Amino acid sequence: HKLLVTPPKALLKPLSIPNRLLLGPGPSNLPPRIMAAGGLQMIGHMSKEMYQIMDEIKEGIQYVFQTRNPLTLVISGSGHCALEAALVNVLEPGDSFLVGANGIWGQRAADIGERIGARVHPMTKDPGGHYTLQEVEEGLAQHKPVLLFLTHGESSTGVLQPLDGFGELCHRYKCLLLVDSVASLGGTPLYMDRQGIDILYSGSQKALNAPPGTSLISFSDKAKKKMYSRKTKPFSFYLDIKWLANFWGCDDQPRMYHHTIPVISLYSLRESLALIAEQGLENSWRQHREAAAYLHGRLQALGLQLFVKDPALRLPTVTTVAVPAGYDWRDIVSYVMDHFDIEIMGGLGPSTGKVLRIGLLGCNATRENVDRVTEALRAALQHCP
């Protein structure tokens, strides 16, 4: 009985957190309702009430995704985790996997792809690039993939990817379409079923304004078949779709314990879905598009140039901006934070050092926040050497 480690003096102080206006690519600031849900008491993780809450979230994801797929649920992990879940259940080792690598995200899909032993074929594009129906038909014809991954909202580049008909294309060639909508969901049009998407995921901490840590996923008929008929077991227990599906009530069988869901994160997630259900999807889309419209105008007035030249390809939720010559982008970002308590970001992955990223997300996608970031940047431009 004698202790190596003594109580950490830091823990003996009270928790203190500064106030910040988060106008980077995410996570975003939480509205009052979501914070309130966050502060609530626990119920039983397998209680009848928890299942009710979970059932509502499912309906919520079906609304925001625009799908009727029964195989739709929450992944108990961040965005990445939902991607990993998708890839680990859909791809058996040796399966051919076509990856739209126009930014960090396709990179991450590829990385995961290699790790789980798929034959990974990366359609690589420079940051700023998007994919045409043809490049995909071409890559599809050449490598005969079981799955294609596409980033809808490329948050690393500010690119909005077209999506239209790609699923139809992919269904000829009998290939599955996997789409990343973590950054795009809620702030730009998206219809899972109508666009024939096989696997769609998104994240909690973007336009939904919930805390980071959960993610959203849905699987088509085709996906469900491939996953339930694989010969091999997926490398992951935590992310195994058969178990997850059962516990989320997507089965005929009674719910069986798998892992303990993040009850409190779910309260918040539910509220975030409640909020956007009340606003309404198309309304939310207009707001992001209009906010984004306003923001670009202000930026160019400052003498800044937008990284993505064709406005139809510009992701409304995350805006990229070329680093103004002569300026140390690091200084600008620090300046905005130091003098304004506002977070903006640099690049990420290929776009590193090449851009600034400003985000308009959910209830934070407002004209008034655009004015704040515009003025903060202006001051930055004025004073930074």
Add this chain to the structure above:
Amino acid sequence: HKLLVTPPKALLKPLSIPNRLLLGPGPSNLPPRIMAAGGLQMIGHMSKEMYQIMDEIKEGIQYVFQTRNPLTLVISGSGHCALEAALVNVLEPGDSFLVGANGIWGQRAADIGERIGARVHPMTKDPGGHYTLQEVEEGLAQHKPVLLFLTHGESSTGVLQPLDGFGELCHRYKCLLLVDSVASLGGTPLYMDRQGIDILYSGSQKALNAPPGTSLISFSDKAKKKMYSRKTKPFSFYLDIKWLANFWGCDDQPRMYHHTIPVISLYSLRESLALIAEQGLENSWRQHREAAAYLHGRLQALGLQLFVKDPALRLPTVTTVAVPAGYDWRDIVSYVMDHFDIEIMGGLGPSTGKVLRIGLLGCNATRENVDRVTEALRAALQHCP
């Protein structure tokens, strides 16, 4: 422009959650401070403040684990996830893995083990069983494992596993010791370094009283070596130790984005560690042991028998109780909930149908909660057919 799915009428109602006294095996009820942290606003996931909070949590885990291992951090997932993280970084396919399968947990380790292609050797015992220094030397001598898994607090059976010297045993035979302390941490003595433990994990939602969804993990010198020198990449990106270690500041390199940590869950986790740092580890141990002592006395007075006969083997945090003959265990559990708003549980895995499980966890491990559960059960016994 026309929508398959309309806003779910359920989401249009306000979030409502009943009041419950959770006295099952977990998750437990949250104290005011943890709820308060839960309701706070977001800061930047890579902000200097977030890293500070993260650094404190690290010190906190070093305190509760009693270790000085630099490779210590939070897994952004539930308990299971921390186990999966451990197994996926430590075991290369074909590696020999010895698993103490005395309940659901060793089962889960084995399941994961098979999935990631290890040669899994299960030392199976009936629920209620524990492992002697010798059975391990024996299994160690026979299969020459790279790793052994042991469940400290077997929450499925109520068994407290001995631990002492096992790491020394395992270090001869050059094998790593992996211990599950999700249920045991904070409510019964545990010293990572002093007991020569190579991989220790625990969970947020047990004696720590934080919400489920994060987990705690630490790696010894030996573990760190094996993981950093493997030839193959682990099957998981999300759980890859090299990336995780870097972002948690365990490296010489600046922190590089990997995934977005669950900022808010971390506020809460920090507070939960702050709380037990203030109480003090040994204090916490006495309380759980004494509460447990009180609880067993009351139960036997009701004519109930404890599943685990030797009191020295009884896990204080989770207590198992044989199903009283003539009684439908399902009725008892429902009765306790319906008439008292108290959650208790049945078995789990091998102990299914065979027991009831009552939990004493952190600030919920109190005499007064013991009186409440005793009286609730008594009434149940009286009225159930």
